[PDB]
Design a protein around this ligand. Structure first.
Ligand SMILES: NS(=O)(=O)c1ccc(Br)cc1
Ligand SMILES: NS(=O)(=O)c1ccc(Br)cc1
Lengths: 304, 304
């Protein structure tokens, strides 16, 4: 029993973190096989950051301009290319600790673990979601760029995020491991505003199920609703629309608890309209939206 | 910027987790040098759990009755002893991945990372505090016993907790790595009630400082207070008393923010009396008490 915001064990990813230096800039790289992945803005002077032309800045860089350090040993760079907003540095040595891995582009609402690193050294691990506005709310200081987000399926690390930048509002933006930004963000020191940070409805419902499973039942009401009726209230409260695909994903939690998805929707509806009234659910005074249905099943069943 | 509930990277501890089996019971063990540490209740039939005499149950066990598996290789048990509520199994092989480590008994309010494991396999990592009633609010299913709590000081893992049991209220109790329970709990399937789960005042203040540092300033008020005046309000709200030792520990956050500790106390005083009024601090609708002053400094400076 009990329900915690829980990150994947970080060991497999710790074994992949290196320090990348280009001139005076140091950030983090991901070493998989004989490639080190890092944000391309490693090549920028903070002067360059204001309006960088990366192709032109890259002409001025050779393999030997990229200093890659793994623990306290230097890796030989024998090649470099730009793929979208990431640099791929070919090194002469395959990472001996390379796990089984995939690169995956996640959807908004998908959760992942971040191993926050500085100088290629892991400092902490926390759980995030891709926000509906394709930002994440991370914890990232200067030097943290190249820190990665991931999921683990048993022994396969799916890398879904690389940290690139902080918006002036102090929310975070980054790429998949093919270097494509989540959302409309660019690696340029220019004012970029995030859209509406809506609540991930399917994630709230999953967490309401997690609450019932852990004995927090006070919010269970005597009502049901429909997707359309629920969605009208959702829209008004800046909740994401719930689709039948969401209802299907919630099926196993529905089955385990004997609470129909639309009944739990009607409970959430009343929580939005009535508020918490100073009560808590799983030790929270607001509705948590950074657990997926899969996260709740995983934690409430004990997958390793 | 941003502020997250952040666990230590778990890699160093992942390399220490083994499966321990005694008869039909499987739980987790910690393998450091040539010793495997596990909860002594590994020797109990759930029948035994109701009123176990561990010395008497242990007479019936030999070295060969303890099955220790690390990955999918069996370790040879060449010795076993009971120290308080843990078994120490001497094995013929020093753990090659043994990190630098200490065993430490933490104080209430101290935070730590838990690597939740099942069958010696890590499933997740989360951040906990030792509650003032010497319980923790964890996430632990059957098979999770022997899961450990830890802090990392650079390359030295301080092990502070081993998971033993769930109280009927679904909060958690365990030992240090010398097998001494935190609080008055015993490894017996008998009704045990926790005392008052008070709020860790010094931890709330640290997190209020973390909030100011990250631009959440709305709760900063025009008042100050004294330790005695603050403590009267604290007592009424089931907050732990604040001592000068707490004020001293908050000094560096005081210095960084230019907010005197007693001023921040007066802000917290108003938050207790006035409540949040539907506002959030660092994305929370209640006052967070599972960050220590040291945690806030570490995250707000970027220690690795
Ligand atoms: N925090 S900011 O000045 O908006 C900024 C945006 C993008 C980059 Br890449 C670097 C800095
Ligand atoms: N959950 S309980 O029945 O109170 C319990 C207490 C202690 C042990 Br050790 C096992 C079970």
């Amino acid at each position: 029993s009990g329900f915690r915001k829980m990150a994947f064990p970080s060991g497999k990813v710790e074994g992949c973190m290196v320090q990348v230096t280009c001139g005076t800039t140091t950030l983090n790289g991901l070493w998989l096989d004989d490639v080190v992945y890092c944000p391309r803005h490693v090549i920028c002077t903070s002067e360059d950051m204001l309006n960088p032309n990366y192709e032109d800045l890259l002409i001025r860089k050779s393999n030997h301009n990229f200093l890659v350090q793994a623990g306290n040993v230097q890796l030989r760079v024998i090649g470099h290319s730009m793929q979208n907003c990431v640099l791929k540095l070919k090194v002469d040595t395959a990472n001996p600790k390379t796990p089984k891995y995939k690169f995956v582009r996640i959807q908004p609402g998908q959760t992942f673990s971040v191993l926050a690193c500085y100088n290629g050294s892991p400092s902490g691990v926390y759980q995030c979601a891709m926000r509906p506005n394709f930002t994440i709310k991370g914890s990232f200081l200067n030097g943290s760029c190249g820190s990665v987000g991931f999921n683990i399926d048993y022994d396969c690390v799916s890398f879904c995020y690389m940290h690139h930048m902080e918006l002036p509002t102090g929310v975070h933006a980054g790429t998949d491991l093919e270097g494509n930004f989540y959302g409309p963000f660019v690696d340029r020191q220019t004012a970029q505003a995030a859209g509406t940070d809506t609540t991930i409805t399917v994630n709230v419902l999953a967490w309401l199920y997690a609450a019932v499973i852990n004995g927090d039942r006070w919010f269970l009401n005597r009502f049901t609703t429909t997707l359309n009726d629920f969605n009208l209230v959702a829209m008004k409260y800046n909740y994401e629309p719930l689709t039948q695909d969401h209802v299907d994903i919630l099926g196993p939690l529905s089955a385990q608890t004997g609470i129909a998805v639309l009944d739990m929707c009607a409970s959430l509806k009343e929580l939005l309209q009535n508020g918490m009234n100073g009560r808590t659910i799983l030790g929270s005074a607001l509705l948590e939206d950074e657990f997926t249905p899969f996260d709740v099943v995983r934690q409430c069943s004990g997958v390793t």
